[PDB]
Every structure is written in C-alpha cells, then in structure tokens.
Amino acid sequence: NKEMRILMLGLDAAGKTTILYKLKLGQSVTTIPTVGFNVETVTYKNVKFNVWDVGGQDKIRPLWRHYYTGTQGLIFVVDCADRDRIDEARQELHRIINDREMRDAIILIFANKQDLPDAMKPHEIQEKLGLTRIRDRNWYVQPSCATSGDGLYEGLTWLTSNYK
Amino acid sequence: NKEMRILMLGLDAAGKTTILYKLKLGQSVTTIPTVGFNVETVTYKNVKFNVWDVGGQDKIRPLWRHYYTGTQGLIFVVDCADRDRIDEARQELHRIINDREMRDAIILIFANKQDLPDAMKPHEIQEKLGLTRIRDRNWYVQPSCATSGDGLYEGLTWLTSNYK
Amino acid sequence: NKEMRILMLGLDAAGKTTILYKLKLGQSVTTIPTVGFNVETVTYKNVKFNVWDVGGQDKIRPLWRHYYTGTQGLIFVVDCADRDRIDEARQELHRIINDREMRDAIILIFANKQDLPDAMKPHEIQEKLGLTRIRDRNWYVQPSCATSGDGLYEGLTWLTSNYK
Amino acid sequence: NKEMRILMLGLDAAGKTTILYKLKLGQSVTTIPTVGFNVETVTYKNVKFNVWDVGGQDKIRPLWRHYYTGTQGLIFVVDCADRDRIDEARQELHRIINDREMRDAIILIFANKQDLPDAMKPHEIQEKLGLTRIRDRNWYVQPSCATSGDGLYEGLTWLTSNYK
Ligand SMILES: Nc1nc2c(ncn2[C@@H]2O[C@H](COP(=O)(O)OP(=O)(O)OP(=O)(O)O)[C@@H](O)[C@H]2O)c(=O)[nH]1
Ligand SMILES: Nc1nc2c(ncn2[C@@H]2O[C@H](COP(=O)(O)OP(=O)(O)OP(=O)(O)O)[C@@H](O)[C@H]2O)c(=O)[nH]1
Ligand SMILES: Nc1nc2c(ncn2[C@@H]2O[C@H](COP(=O)(O)OP(=O)(O)OP(=O)(O)O)[C@@H](O)[C@H]2O)c(=O)[nH]1
Ligand SMILES: Nc1nc2c(ncn2[C@@H]2O[C@H](COP(=O)(O)OP(=O)(O)OP(=O)(O)O)[C@@H](O)[C@H]2O)c(=O)[nH]1
Ligand SMILES: [Mg+2]
Ligand SMILES: [Mg+2]
Ligand SMILES: [Mg+2]
Ligand SMILES: [Mg+2]
C-alpha cells in the first residue's frame, strides 16, 4: 500500500477537471469553472493517488500557495492549442517549480487537446516552456486527448515509475 | 476484495489481445496471433479481474470449450468494419451463450475499430448479431477504439456494476 | 434499510441515462446512444433504489416486457419539447400501464428538457398524455432539467413518500 | 543481490525506448518520441539494472551531462542503417567516453535495426565509430533487433559478465 500526493495546476482552458474525472469515473463530464478546489482519489497499480484540482481562474491564483506542502509530483496541464498564452504558462510553471517546497516535486507536462487543428507538438511545447532549463529533477511531456482518455494512464504510469 | 472471471472470445482480427494489454500495461502493443491462450489480471475499482484471452484462429476453435467453466462474464469482441464475417460472429456468439455452463454469463458486445471508414455503429451490430433474441440476461454493446483505449474502462465499469 | 425497484421507460431522446447518471454521480455525463441496458443503485434518504435503464430504440421495444416483474414504481421520461411525438409517448405509456404486472406501480411522469425554446408546460403534458382520464392509480407529473439536476430530487422524494 | 546503473544514450531513431520496453515488459510496444526521459528497473539474472532512457533530440543533448554521475555501464544505441549520420554518432560517442566521469564505464555498442535491407554490419560499425583505436577500456559491438529481443539478453549478459 503506497501513497502519493499530486498537485494539478495550470491556466484556464487547460482541462484539469476533465482529466481528473476521466481518471476517477472513466467518463467525460461537462464542467462548471471551479472557484475553489476538488479532491479525488484514483487508485491505479498498487499506489493510491490523492490528486488536488486547484482552480486556475485568475481570481484564485494565490490559492496555489496553500497546497505546495507535501507534494510529491506536479501535473502542469497545458492547452497545446492556446499558443497565445504559452508565455504565461511558462512563467507560472517556473514560478511554481522554483519555490522552496516544490524543489523535490516531479514535473509532468500534460499537453491536452492534441486533436485540435492547430495543436502544438510536445517538442514545440518543451521549447516554449523552457523545460531544457530544468536539470535537477525528472520531467516528461505527455500529449493527450482528455475527452477520450488518450494518454492519461500512461502519464500516471510514468509518475508511478519515476518516483525515487 | 471481490473477484470476477471474464472469458474473451471472438473471431480472428477482433483485437482481443490489444484490448487486454491496453488494459493491463496501458500501452498499445504489437502482437503475434496466439495459438493457445493468454492470462492477465487487472484490478480496476475494487474487483480483481482474471481475464482469459483464448485465440480465435480456425485451428484452435474447439479450445473454447475448456474455459466456459466458472465464467461470470463474457466479452465478445467484434470487428465492426469487417462486414463479411459478421454472420460467423453471430453464429459463434449464439453457440457460446446457449451452452449449459454459459447460461449465467453476462454478455458484453465490444465493437472494436470504430475509427475505420466503414465502421458499423452499435445499432447495425445489434441488428446483425440478433441481440434482441437475448432476453434472459443482461447485455450491452460498447463501441471502442482499442489502440487509443477509447471505451475500455467504460465497458469494464459496466461489467462491474451489472453483476448481480 | 428500505428498498424499492424502479423501471425507467420512454422514447428516444428522453434523457433517462442523463437523469440516472446525475442522480448517481452528481456530474453531467456525456452519453452515447445505448443498445442493451444498465442497472444502477442510488441511495437518497434511507431507501435504496435499484433503477433499470433500458434503451428507447424502436427495435428494442419488446425487451421492456421482460423487466416489468416486481416493479414498485415507473418513471416515464418524456421529451417535453418533442410535441410531434407526444402521441407516441401516450401510446407507449398506456400500453405499459394497462398490462397485468404494472398495475400496482407508482407512475411518475418525468418531463425533461424543460429549458428548451419550445418546451411544453406540465398541464399540456397531462392533457396530451391522457393522464386526466386516469382515475384508478397514483400518478404525478414533474418537469425537470437533468443537466442541472432541477426537479430530479423532488420527483425522487415524491416516489419515496407515496410508496408504502 | 547485485546492482548496476546503466545510461542509454544515442541519436534519434536509435530505438532505445523499444529496447527498454522489450527488456522490461517482454513485448514490443508502440512508442511516442520522448522529449524528457524515463527511469526503469529491469531484473534479469541476479543483478538489478537501473536504466536511464534519455531522449536524443538536438535541443536536449546538454541534459546528458547531468546523468553521467555514478555510471557503471554505457549503452550507445546506433541505427545500423543510418550510414549517412554515423559520423555524428562517432563524434558524440567520443565526446561522451572521453569525459572525466564516464571514463570508467563499460561501453556496449548496440547496433539496432539489423534486419533492414541496407543495414551495416558490426565490423563496418567498428571501423566507422573509430572503436578500433580505443585500447584503454572494455567495449563490444553487437547487432540487435529490438522488436524481437534479438541480442538484447546477450548484450545484458555481456554487461553482467564484465562488471566486477
Ligand atoms: N477538444 C478538446 N477539448 C477539451 C478537452 N478537454 C477539455 N476540453 C475543453 O475544456 C473546456 C472546459 O474547461 P474545464 O473543464 O472547466 O477545464 P478547467 O481547467 O478545469 O477549468 P477551471 O476548473 O475553471 O480551471 C471545454 O470547452 C472543453 O471543450 C479535450 O480533451 N479535447
Ligand atoms: N485500427 C485498429 N486496429 C486494431 C485495433 N486493435 C487491434 N487491431 C488490429 O488487429 C491486428 C492484430 O490482431 P490481434 O490483436 O493479435 O488479435 P487476435 O485475434 O488476438 O490475434 P491472435 O491472438 O494472433 O489470433 C493488427 O493488425 C491491428 O491493426 C484497434 O483498436 N484499432
Ligand atoms: N438540454 C438538455 N438536453 C438533454 C438533457 N438530458 C439529455 N439531453 C439530451 O439527450 C441526448 C442524449 O440522449 P440519451 O441521454 O442517450 O437518452 P436515452 O433515451 O437513454 O437514449 P437511448 O439510450 O439511445 O435510447 C443528448 O443529445 C442531450 O443533449 C437535459 O437535461 N437538458
Ligand atoms: N524495424 C525496426 N524498427 C525499430 C526498431 N526499434 C525501433 N524502431 C523504430 O524506431 C522508431 C521509434 O523511435 P524511438 O524508439 O522512440 O527512438 P527515441 O529517439 O529514443 O524516441 P524517444 O524516446 O521519445 O526520444 C519507430 O518508428 C520504429 O519503427 C527495431 O528493432 N526494428
Ligand atoms: Mg475555465
Ligand atoms: Mg489474427
Ligand atoms: Mg439509458
Ligand atoms: Mg526512450
């Protein structure tokens, strides 16, 4: 019986709630923007995941500071078709991961909405996010389509196996 | 701790091995046609599934008779694009489910390969299989695309919840 | 604890699956047109509800007769905006409730999709379904909007209060 | 209980991911090109292998220097059919093995894709990589086919035998 605490952060339109509920229930759901946070538990292999879905609306950005404590892995969900805000995404990612508490956290970049006609590929995303500047911890980029569940469990497996 | 035994049967090119290993490992796999059988264990919600993948090649069709015993649910995987063998699929389904041992088995029709240009919808599948003649047990048709994992866990959840 | 068996019947596009999923999960689930049926358990106050969700296609109408046995309450879901087929809805309802097994069942009329631009009002539903001529049993009409959850728990409470 | 740390480096289209997954799962899998890296554990004989699988894109080559520390063996995977770019592999291999930390690592040259119609033979690979001029360490060239497990376990055995 193993346990791991995961924090889900990112800008709006990233699709974190869809990811979390497709993991838990297995079905796609229609969502109302979260003004606080959601806590769901997902069991996969032999490890119990306590996943925290903190909302990404601009009015509750400072709320992220209260859920860094005790985090083992960070899932930064990115809208791979929202090219206009990838700079803000990069800024937020590097503001999160360079704190004192998040130093030991595993960084998983979850590129969602790969089915869109103008979707950005994982390499262009690792370029835009400046991920090549992260050299002291494990990180990975997983393309996905959340409405179908394409790539969720593979990223969860990567989070499970790369925890040391 | 609950347990359930599942038997996977169907014609060749149905994609049962791809389904089983996309459930077990999480990745799409390259396969060689099984001349015997494969056994994998997949725990999902709270129930431990022992899934039996018996090959569907013509030369090992009589092998199906040795794995009816103790079956709680049957997954009949159907190629929803190969229209030319849906009659043999119907024949085999009704030969399986009308045995004495398989009377208490739950019937899940798994229409695979939905992304093909001439894929049959579940309505045409229920018309070609004659599933309306099954009126003494629970049954359900689930369209899927096994390479992406689209709809596998939905069918697994249906098998879990409809066992009474 | 107390138990009650409920059968959900209705035409296509009625929304029975959405109602059941909203009652069970609290989420608005994106659904796929179903062939076959589901069985789900919902606990509300102190009563355990075993709800049967049978499809509404024309080719699976005869399957309704094999799940009448033991029914305590019937939920007849009606698309309150499909004025062109309220007569078909009336035909189906009167064929159901005038059988031998369903005569002791409590009848709840569930007018869904109340927020549509041309939605019918409950009085028009009563007049079109011919419920105004039913004087020999306990029935009640409840409008609803299943995606938001409005009207669902009121109808469930009415079914609970009238079952003794 | 023996342990050994192995670092897998190479150019694009080398096939390191397929090799690692054939070693770990025993089954060839469909792969997505990584831009980060994986860490996987493979147990073979009596020795536990901690294998590092780092991507080989040009923009992530500098990340290799932060995983040299503690290396006991280096697996340099070469596309034996890419005759045009074997000089780049030679340059990179000589830049790796002549560093301060990687000087004491056991070098295994893994020529993958041996079944291709224009595949190079191990002698040609020795001559092209300049390994014939390396007289100060243990090294070994081996052809392989990752999709079938050809030569993977033999190379792992060679790495095991030469590590003391
Ligand atoms: N094409 C496509 N769109 C998606 C996918 N997942 C989510 N969306 C879109 O995401 C939008 C909904 O946003 P949310 O589900 O609320 O995402 P969120 O980040 O959790 O929102 P907040 O909780 O307010 O931060 C919908 O318009 C969907 O169309 C996907 O996998 N594919
Ligand atoms: N497009 C598509 N093709 C699939 C899918 N699943 C399986 N296939 C095809 O199925 C073929 C392989 O057959 P198998 O997966 O081995 O099915 P099988 O009946 O278990 O074969 P044997 O065990 O050898 O008898 C491949 O050519 C795949 O292209 C799928 O989800 N989508
Ligand atoms: N606006 C609105 N639409 C709804 C609501 N509930 C269901 N729908 C619509 O109903 C359609 C889906 O039909 P289903 O949920 O599958 O109903 P069903 O009777 O179980 O369908 P079948 O099983 O194929 O007979 C979708 O297009 C929804 O838009 C609702 O509460 N509000
Ligand atoms: N024929 C053949 N092709 C192979 C073999 N191994 C790998 N490939 C090919 O290699 C390609 C996949 O590239 P990867 O194995 O992911 O190489 P990579 O650069 O390490 O990818 P990343 O890990 O994401 O960086 C596929 O197109 C395969 O066809 C092999 O053993 N035989
Ligand atoms: Mg939003
Ligand atoms: Mg085959
Ligand atoms: Mg339904
Ligand atoms: Mg790799």
Side-chain angles (χ1 to χ4, degrees):
Chain A
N1 295 325
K2 304 297 182 179
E3 293 186 359
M4 180 178 178
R5 179 172 177 175
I6 296 182
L7 183 61
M8 294 190 66
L9 304 174
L11 310 177
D12 200 355
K16 309 182 288 84
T17 307
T18 301
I19 291 162
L20 181 56
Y21 281 117
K22 187 70 175 182
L23 280 178
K24 181 190 178 182
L25 308 172
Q27 299 177 318
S28 177
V29 297
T30 302
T31 61
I32 301 177
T34 298
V35 300
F37 65 96
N38 301 317
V39 183
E40 304 289 352
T41 299
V42 177
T43 307
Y44 185 47
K45 298 295 186 180
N46 50 9
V47 43
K48 176 181 177 181
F49 292 106
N50 300 310
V51 184
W52 290 74
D53 176 17
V54 187
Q57 299 186 69
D58 301 1
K59 52 186 177 181
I60 59 172
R61 299 286 188 90
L63 181 63
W64 301 358
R65 72 188 181 185
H66 295 286
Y67 305 100
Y68 293 160
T69 303
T71 297
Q72 282 77 49
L74 167 69
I75 297 184
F76 191 77
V77 184
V78 177
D79 191 336
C80 82
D82 194 8
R83 185 184 291 107
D84 291 349
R85 298 191 291 181
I86 196 65
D87 297 332
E88 182 178 357
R90 167 180 71 254
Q91 285 185 346
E92 288 304 311
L93 172 65
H94 284 281
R95 289 178 69 198
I96 293 162
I97 67 177
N98 285 328
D99 204 333
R100 291 182 178 87
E101 182 72 12
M102 301 289 294
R103 284 183 296 170
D104 301 326
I106 310 178
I107 303 174
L108 175 59
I109 303 302
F110 211 73
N112 197 12
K113 303 181 183 181
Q114 283 293 316
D115 54 301
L116 291 180
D118 202 12
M120 291 184 292
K121 300 301 181 179
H123 172 78
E124 299 176 347
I125 293 177
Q126 88 164 326
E127 283 190 4
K128 293 294 183 177
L129 290 182
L131 299 175
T132 60
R133 301 184 296 176
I134 309 170
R135 310 186 179 189
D136 54 354
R137 68 201 79 176
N138 305 339
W139 59 270
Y140 192 89
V141 180
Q142 176 67 57
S144 66
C145 301
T147 51
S148 66
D150 196 335
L152 302 173
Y153 295 98
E154 305 179 52
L156 195 56
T157 308
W158 182 89
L159 281 177
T160 299
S161 293
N162 289 263
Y163 175 81
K164 291 174 179 57
Chain B
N1 294 325
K2 304 297 182 179
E3 293 185 359
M4 180 178 178
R5 179 172 177 175
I6 296 182
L7 183 60
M8 294 191 67
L9 304 174
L11 309 179
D12 195 5
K16 307 183 281 78
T17 308
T18 301
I19 292 164
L20 180 58
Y21 282 115
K22 186 67 177 181
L23 283 176
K24 175 63 178 180
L25 304 177
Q27 296 179 306
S28 180
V29 298
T30 301
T31 61
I32 304 174
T34 303
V35 296
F37 64 96
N38 305 312
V39 183
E40 302 288 348
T41 300
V42 177
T43 304
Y44 186 31
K45 310 297 296 182
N46 51 7
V47 41
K48 176 181 177 181
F49 291 108
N50 303 290
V51 183
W52 290 75
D53 176 18
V54 186
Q57 301 183 65
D58 299 4
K59 50 188 177 181
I60 60 172
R61 293 287 187 86
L63 182 63
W64 299 0
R65 73 188 180 185
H66 295 287
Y67 303 102
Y68 292 160
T69 303
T71 297
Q72 282 78 49
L74 167 70
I75 297 183
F76 191 75
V77 183
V78 175
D79 192 326
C80 83
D82 193 6
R83 299 180 180 268
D84 291 349
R85 295 186 286 177
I86 196 66
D87 299 332
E88 186 176 8
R90 168 179 69 253
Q91 279 190 350
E92 285 305 319
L93 173 64
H94 286 281
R95 286 168 180 170
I96 293 160
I97 67 177
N98 285 328
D99 203 333
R100 291 182 178 87
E101 182 72 12
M102 301 289 294
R103 284 183 296 170
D104 301 326
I106 310 179
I107 303 175
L108 174 61
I109 303 302
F110 213 71
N112 198 13
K113 307 175 183 179
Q114 282 291 317
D115 58 357
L116 290 181
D118 199 15
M120 287 183 288
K121 304 301 180 179
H123 171 65
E124 299 185 4
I125 295 300
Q126 85 171 336
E127 284 187 347
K128 292 295 182 179
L129 292 180
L131 300 170
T132 61
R133 297 178 288 172
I134 309 170
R135 309 184 180 189
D136 54 354
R137 68 201 79 176
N138 305 341
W139 61 269
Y140 182 87
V141 182
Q142 176 68 57
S144 66
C145 300
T147 51
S148 64
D150 196 336
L152 303 174
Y153 291 108
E154 296 176 342
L156 197 54
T157 302
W158 181 88
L159 282 176
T160 299
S161 64
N162 288 262
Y163 176 82
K164 291 174 179 57
Chain C
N1 290 321
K2 190 175 177 180
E3 295 187 357
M4 183 178 181
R5 184 181 184 270
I6 294 183
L7 181 64
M8 295 190 68
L9 305 173
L11 306 179
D12 53 302
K16 300 168 285 185
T17 307
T18 302
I19 298 162
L20 184 54
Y21 276 144
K22 185 65 177 182
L23 289 175
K24 175 63 177 182
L25 309 169
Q27 306 284 313
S28 181
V29 176
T30 302
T31 59
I32 303 174
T34 65
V35 293
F37 61 97
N38 304 312
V39 181
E40 187 61 280
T41 299
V42 176
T43 304
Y44 181 46
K45 299 293 185 178
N46 48 11
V47 179
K48 180 179 178 181
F49 294 98
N50 300 309
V51 182
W52 288 67
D53 172 28
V54 185
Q57 288 185 350
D58 59 328
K59 302 298 182 299
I60 59 180
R61 292 281 203 275
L63 299 182
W64 295 2
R65 294 186 178 91
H66 299 269
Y67 309 107
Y68 293 161
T69 302
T71 298
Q72 283 75 59
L74 167 68
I75 297 183
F76 191 72
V77 183
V78 177
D79 193 334
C80 81
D82 196 1
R83 188 184 293 107
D84 295 347
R85 297 192 296 166
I86 195 64
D87 186 73
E88 302 181 1
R90 170 192 70 91
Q91 294 185 29
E92 294 293 343
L93 179 61
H94 283 280
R95 290 166 186 169
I96 294 160
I97 70 178
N98 287 327
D99 205 329
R100 180 176 177 177
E101 182 71 13
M102 301 286 295
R103 284 173 190 189
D104 297 328
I106 310 176
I107 301 177
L108 171 63
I109 303 303
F110 217 84
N112 199 12
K113 303 180 183 181
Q114 198 63 37
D115 55 2
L116 285 185
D118 201 14
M120 293 181 289
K121 305 302 176 293
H123 182 88
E124 183 179 0
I125 297 297
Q126 291 190 29
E127 284 193 4
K128 293 293 183 178
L129 289 182
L131 306 170
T132 64
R133 302 179 61 185
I134 303 179
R135 313 293 178 87
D136 56 351
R137 61 200 70 195
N138 191 346
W139 62 268
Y140 168 76
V141 180
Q142 173 68 59
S144 66
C145 300
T147 49
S148 66
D150 292 319
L152 275 58
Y153 295 112
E154 291 79 356
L156 193 53
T157 302
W158 181 87
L159 279 179
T160 299
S161 175
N162 287 267
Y163 176 62
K164 290 178 181 58
Chain D
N1 295 325
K2 305 297 182 179
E3 295 183 0
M4 184 177 181
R5 184 181 185 270
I6 294 184
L7 182 64
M8 295 189 66
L9 305 176
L11 308 178
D12 57 293
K16 302 172 289 183
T17 306
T18 304
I19 299 163
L20 181 57
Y21 276 136
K22 181 61 180 181
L23 287 176
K24 174 63 177 181
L25 313 170
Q27 184 179 27
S28 180
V29 300
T30 303
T31 60
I32 303 175
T34 70
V35 303
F37 63 96
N38 303 315
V39 182
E40 188 60 279
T41 297
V42 175
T43 304
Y44 175 65
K45 184 181 179 179
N46 51 8
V47 41
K48 176 182 177 181
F49 292 105
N50 300 310
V51 182
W52 288 68
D53 172 25
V54 184
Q57 287 86 328
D58 59 328
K59 302 299 185 300
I60 60 179
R61 303 278 183 83
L63 299 180
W64 296 1
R65 292 185 178 91
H66 301 269
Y67 309 108
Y68 292 162
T69 302
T71 299
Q72 283 75 59
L74 167 67
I75 296 184
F76 192 69
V77 182
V78 180
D79 193 334
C80 79
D82 196 338
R83 185 184 297 105
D84 293 348
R85 290 191 304 166
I86 196 170
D87 184 74
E88 304 179 358
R90 173 193 67 88
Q91 296 186 28
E92 186 59 31
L93 178 64
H94 282 284
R95 282 190 292 265
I96 293 164
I97 69 179
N98 288 327
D99 203 357
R100 180 174 179 176
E101 183 71 14
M102 300 288 295
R103 66 175 191 186
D104 298 316
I106 309 177
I107 302 177
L108 172 63
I109 303 303
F110 214 72
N112 199 13
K113 303 180 183 181
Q114 197 64 42
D115 56 0
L116 289 182
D118 202 14
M120 293 180 290
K121 274 78 72 175
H123 180 91
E124 298 171 312
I125 295 172
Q126 289 192 28
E127 288 185 349
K128 291 291 184 177
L129 291 181
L131 307 168
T132 64
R133 303 178 61 184
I134 303 179
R135 313 293 179 87
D136 55 352
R137 66 200 71 189
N138 296 324
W139 60 266
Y140 176 72
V141 180
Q142 185 187 44
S144 65
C145 299
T147 57
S148 63
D150 195 317
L152 277 63
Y153 303 105
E154 185 67 27
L156 201 51
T157 301
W158 181 87
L159 280 178
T160 301
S161 176
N162 288 273
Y163 177 66
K164 290 177 181 57

